[model samples]
Target: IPGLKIDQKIRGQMPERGWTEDDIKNTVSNGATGTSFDKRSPKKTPPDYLGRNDPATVYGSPGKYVVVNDRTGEVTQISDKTDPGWVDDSRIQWGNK
Candidate 1:
Protein backbone atom coordinates (compact mmCIF):
# COMPACT_ATOMS: atom_id res chain seq x y z
CA ILE A 1 0.00 0.00 0.00
CA PRO A 2 1.49 3.29 -1.08
CA GLY A 3 2.16 5.64 1.79
CA LEU A 4 0.93 3.09 4.32
CA LYS A 5 2.50 0.33 6.36
CA ILE A 6 1.03 -2.22 8.78
CA ASP A 7 2.10 -5.05 11.00
CA GLN A 8 0.62 -8.45 11.86
CA LYS A 9 -0.84 -7.19 15.14
CA ILE A 10 -2.85 -4.52 13.39
CA ARG A 11 -4.07 -6.98 10.76
CA GLY A 12 -5.12 -9.39 13.50
CA GLN A 13 -6.94 -6.68 15.42
CA MET A 14 -8.66 -5.41 12.30
CA PRO A 15 -10.92 -8.41 12.11
CA GLU A 16 -12.25 -7.83 15.63
CA ARG A 17 -12.60 -4.10 15.21
CA GLY A 18 -14.55 -4.52 11.95
CA TRP A 19 -11.99 -2.29 10.33
CA THR A 20 -10.27 -2.51 7.00
CA GLU A 21 -6.68 -1.35 6.68
CA ASP A 22 -8.10 1.47 4.64
CA ASP A 23 -9.86 2.67 7.76
CA ILE A 24 -6.54 3.40 9.35
CA LYS A 25 -4.81 4.44 6.17
CA ASN A 26 -7.51 6.89 5.22
CA THR A 27 -7.82 8.23 8.73
CA VAL A 28 -4.16 9.08 8.88
CA SER A 29 -3.64 10.05 5.25
CA ASN A 30 -6.61 12.35 5.33
CA GLY A 31 -4.75 14.36 7.94
CA ALA A 32 -7.47 13.96 10.56
CA THR A 33 -5.51 15.61 13.34
CA GLY A 34 -5.16 14.36 16.88
CA THR A 35 -2.79 14.76 19.85
CA SER A 36 1.00 14.48 19.99
CA PHE A 37 3.16 12.72 22.56
CA ASP A 38 4.89 15.44 24.52
CA LYS A 39 7.29 12.99 26.15
CA ARG A 40 8.80 11.86 22.86
CA SER A 41 12.52 12.36 22.38
CA PRO A 42 13.18 15.87 21.22
CA LYS A 43 15.56 14.50 18.60
CA LYS A 44 12.77 13.02 16.49
CA THR A 45 11.32 15.19 13.78
CA PRO A 46 7.54 15.43 13.31
CA PRO A 47 7.10 13.76 16.70
CA ASP A 48 4.41 11.11 17.11
CA TYR A 49 1.41 11.03 14.80
CA LEU A 50 -1.92 10.03 16.29
CA GLY A 51 -5.40 9.88 14.80
CA ARG A 52 -8.87 9.69 16.34
CA ASN A 53 -12.13 8.12 15.23
CA ASP A 54 -15.76 8.77 16.17
CA PRO A 55 -16.62 5.30 17.40
CA ALA A 56 -20.31 6.12 17.72
CA THR A 57 -20.25 6.59 13.98
CA VAL A 58 -16.98 5.15 12.69
CA TYR A 59 -16.43 2.18 14.94
CA GLY A 60 -20.03 1.76 16.14
CA SER A 61 -18.79 1.85 19.75
CA PRO A 62 -16.66 4.06 21.94
CA GLY A 63 -14.10 5.94 19.91
CA LYS A 64 -10.64 4.48 19.24
CA TYR A 65 -7.27 5.99 18.46
CA VAL A 66 -4.43 5.09 16.08
CA VAL A 67 -0.73 5.86 16.04
CA VAL A 68 1.50 6.05 12.99
CA ASN A 69 5.03 6.82 11.90
CA ASP A 70 4.57 10.03 10.02
CA ARG A 71 7.94 9.81 8.34
CA THR A 72 7.78 6.21 7.15
CA GLY A 73 3.99 5.93 6.97
CA GLU A 74 4.05 2.91 9.23
CA VAL A 75 1.01 2.11 11.35
CA THR A 76 2.40 1.39 14.79
CA GLN A 77 -0.54 0.78 17.11
CA ILE A 78 -4.18 1.33 17.84
CA SER A 79 -6.02 1.56 21.12
CA ASP A 80 -9.34 2.55 22.64
CA LYS A 81 -7.94 4.92 25.24
CA THR A 82 -5.86 7.99 24.50
CA ASP A 83 -2.78 8.36 26.65
CA PRO A 84 -3.36 10.89 29.48
CA GLY A 85 -0.50 13.26 28.73
CA TRP A 86 -1.00 13.66 24.99
CA VAL A 87 -1.89 17.19 23.96
CA ASP A 88 -3.23 18.50 20.71
CA ASP A 89 -0.41 19.47 18.37
CA SER A 90 -1.73 23.01 18.07
CA ARG A 91 -1.78 23.54 21.83
CA ILE A 92 1.77 22.32 22.32
CA GLN A 93 4.85 24.48 21.85
CA TRP A 94 7.16 21.68 20.70
CA GLY A 95 5.29 20.42 17.64
CA ASN A 96 4.68 23.84 16.12
CA LYS A 97 8.16 25.23 16.64
Candidate 2:
Protein backbone atom coordinates (compact mmCIF):
# COMPACT_ATOMS: atom_id res chain seq x y z
CA ILE A 1 0.00 0.00 0.00
CA PRO A 2 1.15 3.53 -0.71
CA GLY A 3 1.65 4.98 2.75
CA LEU A 4 2.90 7.84 4.80
CA LYS A 5 6.37 6.87 5.89
CA ILE A 6 7.67 6.67 9.44
CA ASP A 7 9.44 9.99 9.48
CA GLN A 8 11.07 10.23 12.89
CA LYS A 9 11.20 9.08 16.48
CA ILE A 10 7.78 9.39 18.01
CA ARG A 11 8.02 8.73 21.73
CA GLY A 12 11.32 6.91 21.95
CA GLN A 13 12.03 5.73 18.45
CA MET A 14 9.42 5.02 15.82
CA PRO A 15 9.66 1.27 15.81
CA GLU A 16 12.85 -0.36 14.75
CA ARG A 17 11.76 -1.39 11.25
CA GLY A 18 9.65 1.53 10.05
CA TRP A 19 5.96 1.88 10.84
CA THR A 20 3.02 -0.20 9.82
CA GLU A 21 -0.18 1.34 8.46
CA ASP A 22 -1.61 0.95 11.93
CA ASP A 23 1.44 2.58 13.48
CA ILE A 24 1.30 5.90 11.63
CA LYS A 25 -2.31 6.40 12.69
CA ASN A 26 -1.60 5.53 16.33
CA THR A 27 -1.24 9.12 17.42
CA VAL A 28 -3.16 8.55 20.62
CA SER A 29 -0.46 6.32 22.07
CA ASN A 30 2.60 8.29 21.05
CA GLY A 31 3.19 12.05 20.87
CA ALA A 32 6.24 12.93 18.87
CA THR A 33 6.22 16.40 17.33
CA GLY A 34 8.87 17.21 14.81
CA THR A 35 9.07 19.13 11.59
CA SER A 36 6.34 18.47 9.09
CA PHE A 37 6.94 20.20 5.75
CA ASP A 38 3.35 19.86 4.67
CA LYS A 39 2.46 23.44 5.46
CA ARG A 40 4.81 24.78 2.82
CA SER A 41 3.04 23.03 -0.01
CA PRO A 42 -0.58 23.76 -0.90
CA LYS A 43 -0.80 23.68 -4.71
CA LYS A 44 -2.32 27.13 -4.32
CA THR A 45 -1.21 30.18 -6.22
CA PRO A 46 1.71 31.79 -4.41
CA PRO A 47 2.96 35.26 -3.57
CA ASP A 48 6.05 37.28 -4.31
CA TYR A 49 9.03 37.41 -2.00
CA LEU A 50 10.28 40.78 -0.82
CA GLY A 51 13.82 39.58 -0.32
CA ARG A 52 13.12 38.84 3.39
CA ASN A 53 14.87 42.03 4.48
CA ASP A 54 12.09 44.31 3.34
CA PRO A 55 10.80 46.66 6.03
CA ALA A 56 7.29 45.27 5.62
CA THR A 57 8.12 42.14 7.53
CA VAL A 58 10.00 42.22 10.83
CA TYR A 59 13.05 40.03 11.22
CA GLY A 60 13.02 37.42 13.97
CA SER A 61 11.60 34.01 13.47
CA PRO A 62 10.83 32.32 10.22
CA GLY A 63 8.88 29.09 10.15
CA LYS A 64 12.04 27.21 9.28
CA TYR A 65 15.66 28.23 9.52
CA VAL A 66 17.59 26.96 6.53
CA VAL A 67 21.26 26.17 6.16
CA VAL A 68 22.81 27.34 2.90
CA ASN A 69 26.32 26.50 1.80
CA ASP A 70 27.23 29.65 -0.09
CA ARG A 71 30.18 27.89 -1.58
CA THR A 72 28.14 25.13 -3.19
CA GLY A 73 24.59 26.57 -3.19
CA GLU A 74 23.36 23.68 -1.07
CA VAL A 75 20.53 24.38 1.36
CA THR A 76 18.73 22.50 4.13
CA GLN A 77 16.43 23.25 7.02
CA ILE A 78 17.54 23.08 10.63
CA SER A 79 15.01 20.64 11.99
CA ASP A 80 16.31 20.70 15.54
CA LYS A 81 16.80 24.19 16.86
CA THR A 82 18.50 22.92 20.01
CA ASP A 83 20.92 20.68 18.21
CA PRO A 84 24.44 21.27 19.46
CA GLY A 85 25.76 20.88 15.96
CA TRP A 86 23.91 23.86 14.47
CA VAL A 87 26.22 26.31 12.79
CA ASP A 88 26.25 29.98 11.78
CA ASP A 89 25.77 31.55 8.33
CA SER A 90 22.33 30.05 7.79
CA ARG A 91 19.24 31.84 6.55
CA ILE A 92 15.74 32.12 8.01
CA GLN A 93 12.50 32.12 6.07
CA TRP A 94 8.99 32.86 7.20
CA GLY A 95 7.16 29.58 7.00
CA ASN A 96 7.66 28.77 3.31
CA LYS A 97 9.37 31.97 2.33
Candidate 3:
Protein backbone atom coordinates (compact mmCIF):
# COMPACT_ATOMS: atom_id res chain seq x y z
CA ILE A 1 0.00 0.00 0.00
CA PRO A 2 3.04 2.23 -0.09
CA GLY A 3 3.21 5.11 -2.56
CA LEU A 4 -0.59 5.35 -2.42
CA LYS A 5 -1.93 8.89 -2.22
CA ILE A 6 -5.52 8.85 -1.10
CA ASP A 7 -7.74 11.86 -1.60
CA GLN A 8 -8.04 13.98 1.53
CA LYS A 9 -11.78 13.53 1.97
CA ILE A 10 -11.75 9.72 1.79
CA ARG A 11 -8.64 9.15 3.88
CA GLY A 12 -8.25 8.58 7.62
CA GLN A 13 -9.88 5.34 8.75
CA MET A 14 -7.05 4.48 11.08
CA PRO A 15 -7.41 3.84 14.77
CA GLU A 16 -8.24 6.69 17.21
CA ARG A 17 -8.15 9.49 14.64
CA GLY A 18 -10.84 7.96 12.45
CA TRP A 19 -12.92 4.86 11.91
CA THR A 20 -11.48 1.97 13.89
CA GLU A 21 -12.19 -1.72 13.28
CA ASP A 22 -14.62 -1.53 16.16
CA ASP A 23 -16.62 1.13 14.40
CA ILE A 24 -16.93 -1.07 11.35
CA LYS A 25 -17.72 -3.99 13.60
CA ASN A 26 -20.41 -2.07 15.43
CA THR A 27 -21.97 -0.90 12.19
CA VAL A 28 -22.11 -4.46 10.92
CA SER A 29 -23.47 -5.56 14.26
CA ASN A 30 -26.25 -3.04 13.88
CA GLY A 31 -27.66 -3.03 10.33
CA ALA A 32 -25.29 -1.52 7.79
CA THR A 33 -26.03 -3.27 4.51
CA GLY A 34 -22.92 -2.23 2.65
CA THR A 35 -19.73 -0.21 3.04
CA SER A 36 -16.57 0.75 1.21
CA PHE A 37 -13.14 2.24 1.88
CA ASP A 38 -10.60 4.01 -0.29
CA LYS A 39 -6.84 3.93 -0.83
CA ARG A 40 -5.36 7.08 -2.32
CA SER A 41 -2.31 7.68 -4.47
CA PRO A 42 -1.13 10.79 -6.25
CA LYS A 43 -0.90 8.97 -9.53
CA LYS A 44 -4.05 8.20 -11.47
CA THR A 45 -4.81 4.99 -13.26
CA PRO A 46 -7.50 3.62 -15.59
CA PRO A 47 -11.05 4.31 -14.48
CA ASP A 48 -12.41 2.50 -11.50
CA TYR A 49 -15.93 2.98 -10.11
CA LEU A 50 -15.09 6.46 -8.84
CA GLY A 51 -13.27 7.21 -12.09
CA ARG A 52 -16.01 7.40 -14.70
CA ASN A 53 -13.92 9.28 -17.24
CA ASP A 54 -14.46 6.10 -19.21
CA PRO A 55 -17.77 4.28 -19.61
CA ALA A 56 -19.40 3.08 -16.41
CA THR A 57 -19.17 -0.59 -15.65
CA VAL A 58 -22.98 -0.73 -15.58
CA TYR A 59 -25.91 1.63 -15.63
CA GLY A 60 -26.86 3.42 -12.44
CA SER A 61 -29.77 2.06 -10.43
CA PRO A 62 -32.27 3.66 -8.10
CA GLY A 63 -31.74 3.17 -4.34
CA LYS A 64 -28.14 2.09 -4.85
CA TYR A 65 -25.45 3.44 -2.52
CA VAL A 66 -23.01 5.94 -3.95
CA VAL A 67 -19.61 7.33 -3.11
CA VAL A 68 -18.79 10.65 -4.69
CA ASN A 69 -15.23 11.50 -5.65
CA ASP A 70 -14.13 14.71 -4.00
CA ARG A 71 -11.75 15.75 -6.79
CA THR A 72 -13.91 15.04 -9.82
CA GLY A 73 -17.28 15.29 -8.05
CA GLU A 74 -18.63 12.14 -9.71
CA VAL A 75 -21.28 9.94 -8.11
CA THR A 76 -21.10 6.15 -8.36
CA GLN A 77 -23.79 3.88 -7.03
CA ILE A 78 -22.83 0.20 -7.05
CA SER A 79 -25.96 -1.55 -5.84
CA ASP A 80 -29.64 -1.50 -6.73
CA LYS A 81 -31.46 -2.85 -3.71
CA THR A 82 -31.05 -4.08 -0.17
CA ASP A 83 -30.84 -7.82 0.37
CA PRO A 84 -33.98 -9.64 1.30
CA GLY A 85 -33.47 -12.53 3.72
CA TRP A 86 -34.77 -16.01 3.07
CA VAL A 87 -37.89 -17.09 4.87
CA ASP A 88 -36.09 -19.34 7.33
CA ASP A 89 -32.74 -17.66 7.72
CA SER A 90 -31.64 -14.10 8.20
CA ARG A 91 -28.19 -14.68 6.75
CA ILE A 92 -29.38 -15.94 3.39
CA GLN A 93 -30.40 -13.02 1.24
CA TRP A 94 -30.71 -11.78 -2.33
CA GLY A 95 -27.51 -11.67 -4.36
CA ASN A 96 -26.04 -8.51 -5.85
CA LYS A 97 -27.53 -7.20 -9.06
Best by TM-score: 1
Model with the higher TM-score, candidate 1 or 2 = 1
lDDT for model 2, please: 0.28
Error of 3 at 14 (Å): 32
Using lDDT, give the best candidate's number. Answer: 1
Those runs of model 3 whose alpha carbons end farther than 4 Å from true positions after fitting are 1-37, 40-44, 47-63, 82-97
TM-score of 2: 0.19
lDDT by residue (tens digit), candidate 2, 20-64: 435334431243222222212333213432222111111122221
Query: Residue 17's C-alpha lDDT in candidate 3?
Result: 29
lDDT of 3: 0.30
lDDT of 3 by residue, 1-97 (tens): 0112234333332332234334333423343233233334424433453422422112112232233333343323222234332122222222353
**Which of candidates 2 and 3 reaches a greater TM-score?**
3
Clashing pairs in 3: 5-40, 5-41, 6-40
Ordered by TM-score, highest first, the candidates read 1, 3, 2
lDDT of 1 by residue, 1-97 (tens): 2246666767887766556766665665555344333233435324343432211111111245555544445555555333444332332222122
